[PDB]
Amino acid sequence: GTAENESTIFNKSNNSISLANSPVKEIRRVTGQVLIEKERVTRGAQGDGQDFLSNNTAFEIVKVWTETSPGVTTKEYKQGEDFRLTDGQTIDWSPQGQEPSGGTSYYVSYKYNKRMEAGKDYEVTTQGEGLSKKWYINFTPSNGAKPIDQTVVLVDYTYYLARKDSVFINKYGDIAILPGEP
């Protein structure tokens, strides 16, 4: 069997997410929402221009701002006017509102879906034996990009099917067995 877009809500209190299908042969993908906080962006020289995020699968901008000391917000820019998210790749200052001066540095905070990597963002492990055996995606690596708390993680993977067969005896006494559908 192939399981695809298998959905589990990730918990910060418990990094380990179970795969539903017990007898996993192998995993094909893992993906989830990641937040990047305080990504330093440098303002391009073209007025009303674009500025490029370090990830191309971004879908929501949380905040755009400048600071005179750590955590003190000097200006926050107001999305819709000021700037917008263009193509999921760029902050776009073509709206009629304010923008940072050219060449200055400002902060962006944004959400993107990551293709998680085995041995880098997550590791895979098992606990039980038999039908109570389970596969887990643990997100154990500390430098690994963990999903946002209380968001969907998707898994795609393959698992062994069972089969159930019927035993018959005919009038000649020959035992015959008919295979079921896997």
Binding site: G47, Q50, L53, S54
Partner: protein, 184 residues
């Protein structure tokens, strides 16, 4: 080069077999025969450029999956699209534009000098950059300032306090931040 040959059969006399063996022996031993021309090819190929600096058309070389511009250590020219450059951990402090990366070889494959050039017709967006790379370490990107047509660059339509690149500019029509009464 080409051999003249006719297939011999059990009905052909020994003279015919002799004639074809002579045709073979002559084509293989004449002036500038196949052996001589192949020895000339081996000799001249050894003097040639055995590794690619462009592709086979004279366009930029391709590159694999990279996390950073420092992951490109093979010599030659690489076009990098604005969308790919954006995603790199060690991109320069600038707007995302299409660029070309030129990689200069050294004494070892673990070290390089990198040059980067932006691909814009706007004189405020055309830039040249360079750095040294050694394993995972590098210098910062060294920005080089060009005078457009040997003149100071002109800035307008911004607050003067929002200018942040070093150097000498003519400022006019500024939206704010100027001294009292100073228009340009």
């Amino acid at each position: 080069m080409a051999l003249n040959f006719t297939t011999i059969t059990e009905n052909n006399v020994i003279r015919d077999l002799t004639t074809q063996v002579n045709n073979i022996g002559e084509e293989l031993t004449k002036e500038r025969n196949i052996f001589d021309i192949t020895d000339d090819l081996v000799y001249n190929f050894n003097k040639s450029q055995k590794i690619k600096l462009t592709d086979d058309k004279g366009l930029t070389k391709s590159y694999g999956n990279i996390t950073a511009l420092r992951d490109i250590k093979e010599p030659g020219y690489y076009y990098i699209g604005a969308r790919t450059l954006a995603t790199l951990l060690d991109r320069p402090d600038m707007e995302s534009l299409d660029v070309v990366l030129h990689v200069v070889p050294l004494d070892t494959s673990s070290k390089v000098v990198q040059h980067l050039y932006t691909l814009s017709t706007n004189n405020n967006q055309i830039k040249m950059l360079y750095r040294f790379v050694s394993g995972n370490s590098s210098s910062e990107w060294q920005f080089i300032q060009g005078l457009p047509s040997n003149k100071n660059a002109v800035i307008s339509g911004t607050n003067i306090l929002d200018i942040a690149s070093p150097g000498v500019y003519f400022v006019m029509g500024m939206t704010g931040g100027m001294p009292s009464g100073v228009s340009s």
